[model samples]
Target chain A: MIPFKDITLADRDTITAFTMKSDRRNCDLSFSNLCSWRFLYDTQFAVIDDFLVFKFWAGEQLAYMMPVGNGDLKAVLRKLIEDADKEKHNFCMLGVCSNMRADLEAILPERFIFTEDRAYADYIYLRSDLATLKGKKFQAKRNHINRFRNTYPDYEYTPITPDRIQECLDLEAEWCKVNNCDQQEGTGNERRALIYALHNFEALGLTGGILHVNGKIVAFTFGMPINHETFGVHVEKADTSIDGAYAMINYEFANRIPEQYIYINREEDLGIEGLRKAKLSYQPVTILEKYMACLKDH
Target chain B: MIPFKDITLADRDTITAFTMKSDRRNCDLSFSNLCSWRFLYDTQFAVIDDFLVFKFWAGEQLAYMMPVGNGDLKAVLRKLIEDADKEKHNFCMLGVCSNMRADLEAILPERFIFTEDRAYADYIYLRSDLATLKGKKFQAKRNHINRFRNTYPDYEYTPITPDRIQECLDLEAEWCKVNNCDQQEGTGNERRALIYALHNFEALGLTGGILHVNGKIVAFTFGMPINHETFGVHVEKADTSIDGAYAMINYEFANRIPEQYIYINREEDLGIEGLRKAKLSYQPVTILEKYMACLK
Candidate 1:
């Protein structure tokens, strides 16, 4: 066996060449869950046939650290699921992209759901292969395009270059102030998470677009691949004060979504009764079913 | 003209009634669009006209709150929905229901959305009158019934009497400690809020059940009606370690549920990813559409 040494994040100087924060969104795993977990228990982490696979749709800067290869992901995940089981948790279904769900389901005797149908976000992708979006429900989407063409007459899609970053951030915050909600999220932490995630988008191999209403970033949305070809929206903040600001931004999403991307995950509704309705209206193709399993006797 | 007071929670007695000590899941409206506008600067009582709408979802005991008056609901909800317009708020489907949807749509024209055939939530109800749990997803349920029946062949069912209250509370605490999560929420500004809500369950006409394994309370659930008929489950908790604990408790729910009730609201999924999946499995038989309208 080829031997590998134990790697830790704190040994910055020693592993400078070996480990780098390629995806700055990767830092959040260290900051929030990973960092806090590390802060409390000296969160010792190593990839000895076991590494935490971080993905995007989970959240902008969200990280789900699954233990792999060192032992059974089924056992670890099942244990984690069991721990989270609050109300007679009967079963769990993870709409996971990888083979992990199938592998775990086979070993643990739990149904691992992988849905072919899923819901899209309120926005569409600009870079997406227009053919994929060539469907019936997208009529409203085309209406938004035509309406924006007739209504805003002033709305313009501007590529976000490094020079325009500050302007974008300021406009987003001012709109947040006007709209009376955080620019990046429904709550403060979410806002912070999004801000941090947005700032690191470039490093994470992400792309975003802005709609300038009179030279200000009145609307914005960012995109990144969650797995291989699935594009997941990290954050989109707009001035609800203006008509068609959101429509235009998503219109840009419809135009800009990468061709390789198959679907856009607006992400989970988080049980917020209200958010669910809105997601349903744009008509998510399907809600990717994520599963949870409890140890039968544990 | 009818005159009403939009009072704050500044009154000493009133504040005591509203403040909760340990609440975990209550939506923090302080900065939330609804709270920023309606909760006002005092952060006391969020009143629209004279009616007070209270919340205790985050482990607060005070689940009994008068629905903010029809007119007030119309006013506040409209403002929230309008804000959500471009915010791309995809959750608040006010368009489906009546005043809640119609009222807001009337106020904010473009912001209002209505789609009749949209699938929101699966509303599950106990069909005690019928022999079969037909139309209801039965594969998992049938297994649960078999497992529960076979395991507890010698067991029995009983009401969650006041005498068993202490044991139920202890079991709740034990489950919480074991889960490493707050059961009754915790002692904080939040805890006090829920405890306040808890006190209202009885007065607000809340009813509940307890599951006993060999006669010791292991699981519990509480609920009340949303309207004159349909019941809304306010809260339910169980020890997953105990096999069939949840099924037995729900079985009790099926048997004990009243005749007139048309629907059961397990309530919103709160957008939590894992929680969304868990709720889906029981297969909600309607997901009640709740909304916040945009303010002009």
Candidate 2:
């Protein structure tokens, strides 16, 4: 079994060499996600047979991102199985994009079973849709925005600056407490991820804006480009009490992102009903269907 | 009557604040287009009444990009008139988007005249259409790509890096000479613009790719994002003698641009018959109907 090394800032080039070549454009394939969430996920990586491999723990469970790189798919899968078998663990591929399913099905027909992993599937939205929030479908969202405008007509928006980071953190902590983040599995991981993003926001190349009402940070959201085209929103926390704060942040952030991101990825919902409802309300153009594949006879 | 200063890297925030808020989404509205060609067009910028204003010399002729920022549009137009009036220069508004035409027509009815600036109007195409070049309309393009693949089977495409900057420049120079950039009015400025882009590619946040066929740079193209969903292809030059050089470069660059770019703006054709024919061959989704507006 090959040892998996922790992903670091230095791996950006080598990792992107594989990630960039992929046409799948999945959020999990991004170096930003793999590198930034390293501590939270125990993310470690290895390069075998020209394939960039990721091995990580999901709450003490073994998992892997679909092996990136254009090498022979069967050969790569075999290599993965060998590695996992040595550890007496079933070879489990996590967050496998739907596009790779057919290849797996064809190459290892009847060898493995697949399960629809809804929690891991990323919710993707058209940047334009979020920015405009136009038409009848978005009327409710627009009304919320208008209500917020009416309520806090003098609210201000600014790109999060170095001086404002502390306040942003304060808001994050308060919001986490309100949601009882420590008591929730999904929220706990997200809380840790958001902290990592804020502490090293500049180094991670993350950009975001803050919403201020009466001179205090009420809402803040930051994200980075996952690949060339998709934006991964690592964190977005706002005072739920504030009318339209979430809607405003969503609209503003979409506008703030560099023109390069046509799609906005709010990440996964973790099967949390409330989170799922919120994400669904955004009307994602598509949800990248993630799957977990393991030996059928295991 | 604010004096315009040359657009500098320092002004990115202010420019983008106004430019990003615009729903117009035209190539001309981008700071990338305005700043990258500063040398070529003698680009200058200013802020008046909280509106971002751009002044530039288009081949030694003066012009202005429609003022950006959410401000009094009609008042802004009047201010522009007041400024140009002092110098007795025609207040030429270049690359005005069709969306802004009605506003101008309404605000200053009969005060200014309008004419189609077909040459300056941008050629915009769907990114997927360019990337795949599928269907009967693009059969010739696909064939060109096919021929290139068959001829240069081992060709490599790499995102242009600092190490390969010199090679890209070499290709650009050769392309310019082949096209007789110095002899032609449009090509000359474009040559100068390409030089500016290569030198300041990093500072300008530009992305592009180089096609190396048999170990030498044969074609290179670079562009920057115009907005969230469109890319403006500032420069695309290749050795036309290669069977599919142009088609291959276009296809490859369109694919290479970050996913955010749903549309590709090939820039303007300047009414050159050959250039217009070439642009039309790509089958643009729409041409941004640029108009020249001046005091009647």
Candidate 3:
């Protein structure tokens, strides 16, 4: 067994080296996901036999994510099984993208069971589709954007610069007021993650845009590129009380991203009813199917 | 079993809520230690029966630090034994401070093994002494500070702000060119931690100071309050080529902290030969002895 330790910023480049080797499109297949949510999940990692073994705790349950590296998958799976047995944990893996399911099954025919849910599925859409809102299916979204434009003619769009970070946080605090975000299960964690993003925007290598009306920020969004073609949206907070603020921010922010990024991943809804509805309203081009694999009779 | 995940800024308040309950003076007892090195150690946490169970890897070996809760210590030790058994590894605890050893022995006496290292001990100094460099022990330090003052009379101390962050990094990179900081075991992690601190200074609630000599940053230092009585110095880098840059920055930075912080903790030396010698030269008022416990 290889020794593993807490994830640190120093390991960013090292972890990125492994993550890029696998072309899995899931949002979790990025160093940004590990860095941004390190504390929330207590994420840890190790490289055994040259494979990056990433483990995290989901409550009392311990599980490993798909290992990254160009090493043998069979050996890695076998090691994970041994580790789970030694640790007295259920042999399970989280954030397994659809593309890797077959690869995993081929290695262990009937030993593992795969499960999934729509809430944890990533909502990905074409950059042009979200940026332009050209089709009839996007008619409602267009109407919301138009209404927001009409009512807030004094609206302005600005990149979230160092001087303007506090305004974004202030707007988020107000948004929480209307949504009772603080009372929610994980919004407290969510809000802290946003604050960290806002505070370390440049260090985290994140790009952001904010919506302001009458000199007050109404909505703000930010994200980082998860891979070559995908931009992952980590934060998209808006004052829902404001008419169409969410839709307007989404469209404007989408336009700000480079056209070279063909896909925009809004990430998982975590089974949150409101978030699922909002993500569905955007009419994603595809829901990136995600899965969890558990050993049935280990 | 309890759920544990990587420690993030989001878990700071939650983790701090438990950590602050204990009056442990060890630097590892704070959130800054956790957040600053989140990636390097693969830090993770879980709340088992309301206890904030923290775990991290040291190489391929797994170890638990002291559990932070008012619950049964004996029960916690038993569970750790079970965990180590199930994991096919020894149950070990790191960062066992001098103050907590007796508590450990009382709870699981003779069932554990203990070890100590001079390098891992924290070098604590009276804030007034470090700020003043008074008396015979700090005489060499004062000479360095005075020579630096004379050599760079035009130097100014500036608080680390967003605008000047890049300058710090630029100097650090140059320093690394000569020192090969990247070649060191933890310096790569150290550099990243510093960048994170610089980028999120305000959010992390940290205070920093930099020395600009002849309009170029010659030295930079930053730290956070580890406890009510002590301020912990997380990073202090200087152009070693300069005669008194290190000593000068140490003195000036010490004075800049609020006088109310009566003590300053320079953290552990990790048994690094040079670091232990340098920390010893500061004439620490006391060394917060630290320990690591292994299951027998």
Candidate 4:
């Protein structure tokens, strides 16, 4: 069995080397997300034949990410299956992109079943599209931003430096109260993850922006690069009562992003209807489809 | 005695909160610099009455930073002195900026012997001056950049992302070879610090830029904010074989810095003649003077 150790900040360079080399658009592969969510997922990893393999629990079931690196896929999968078998747990894989799914089928034909959950698919947009908000398709977004600008002429956007972190958190707490995060299990988990991200914002090498009106924070968002060209936004929150706060933050933060990131991954919708509609409203260039695979029984 | 714990990434928030509040322009107070050079200096810190106090071994002597916060200075100094006495180490303070020196004198009533060091004073330039290269004083600088542009029309500037970190490190190693870092103790320590900063670049919340000439990295620089209005350049390395590589990076990185930072702290020249000349030629807006203080 491969010795998989719990993921920590120390493992970032090793894990990121493989993820960056793979250059996948999926948000799940981002190092910041992995570390922030590690507590909830029980994530662990091991290096096999230069391939970085991940093992974690999806609820009660064990799961893995497609081993990321230049290596024989069949051998790496076999090692993973053997590792799971040795522990008497069923082998499963999560966050399998289309190309990876194709590779799995070609490597072990009819040996596994693949399924996709719409909620788990990532929403990816051309950073330019979001930054410019040009063309008819983005008319409503433009209107929303304009409304926000007119409503709060004093609105300001600033990068989330260490000094402003506590302000962001205060806003998050207030947002949680309004959203009733304590009653909802999913949101509660999300709050924990967001807190983890903000607390380690600098150390995680994450980029973030905050929106303030009248000297009080109304909206804030932060994320890290998923790959060389794709940046993944882990959290974005705004006061719903404020008109166009979300739209304003979305557009402002997009504009602030470094030009190297051609695409922005806003992450999955978790099957929430409002979130799905909101993400679709952005007119993503791609859904970045993902799948889950489980080995077939004899 | 105050409990002085070794500085680590975990302490970044605690330390930065105090540093940011103090709003000092000194580069030594920057969290990234403290962490990167922590090993060489044996740096540690303690919190007294909400004031952050730093203690480190400067060569063989123990030194402290002016306790940074909005509280009683005399009380904090009394605690630091008691802490030092408990350990039987002489209480000293380094990186004392001009305003802090005045406070020290007013609070302790000539208890500290203060001395300024020209080599350690920071060179601060207007961000717009470096970014724009305007006016008569900066004509030579503008010429250097223009020469660089004509020499390498294909040069591109990009933010130093995760993918390009290794390339920057390779360039640093090559620069070190050319500069003979191994032979000099100061450069050797600098090389180590640079490696530490790059390795933990993201976690440290550092911002950096890299210049590429025809898709090959020629120069790279990285630093963190010293205060709300100042950004410190901790490390800047270039291929000396290429003319104007340094000037190009200096200008390009300044252009890339966020607009909120009014001043760019290029840090001290360490009494190096060539480096001091190079820094002076840029025409700094102010020399952020620093002093060393010992408890009398």
**What DockQ values do the models have?**
0.01, 0.01, 0.04, 0.01
lDDT of 2 by residue, A1-298 (tens): 4545556545667777776556655777666567556544546678887888998756435677788777787887887787666544577887667778888888888887789968878899988889999988889899988998999999998898766776787898898789888668667656655665564566556788999999888999887767778877777889887878988988888888877788888888988899899999989999998888887755
Best by DockQ: 3
lDDT of 3: 0.77
Writing each residue's lDDT as its tens digit, candidate 3 over A236-284 gives 8876658888888889999988887789998988898978888888888
Clash pairs detected, candidate 4: A203-B203, A205-B202
Candidate 4 structure quality by residue, lDDT tens digits, A19-66: 876768899888888877764665678899789998886644768888
Write down the worst ten-residue block by lDDT for model 1 chain A: A54-63
Task: Score each candidate by Cα lDDT.
Answer: 0.45, 0.75, 0.77, 0.83
Model 1 agreement with the true structure over B1-296: per-residue lDDT tens digits: 11111222112233223322211111221112112122111122334443344322111011212233434655544343342342223324221244445545565677644443323332344443221444457567667767988987766666654444445555665776787766333322222222222322333344678776776666787665444345556556788777887766766775566766655556555465666776676665445443433233
CA RMSD of each candidate after superposition: 19.6, 21.7, 24.1, 23.3
Cα DockQ of the candidate 1 complex: 0.01
Model 1 ranges off by over 4 Å: A1-102, A110-135, A178-186, A272-274, B1-296
TM-score of the B chain in each candidate versus the native B chain: 0.61, 0.91, 0.91, 0.97
Q: Return the TM-score for each candidate structure.
A: 0.37, 0.49, 0.53, 0.52
Question: Which window of ten consecutive residues has the lowest lDDT sum in model 3 chain B?
Answer: B1-10
lDDT of 3 by residue, B71-101 (tens): 7777777777776675456888987877678
Least accurate 10 contiguous residues by lDDT in model 1 chain B: B56-65
Which should have the higher DockQ, number 1 or number 3?
A: 3
In terms of lDDT, the poorest run of 10 residues in model 4 chain A is A1-10
Clash count, one per candidate? 92, 4, 32, 2
Query: Sorted by TM-score, highest first, which candidate order results?
Result: 3, 4, 2, 1
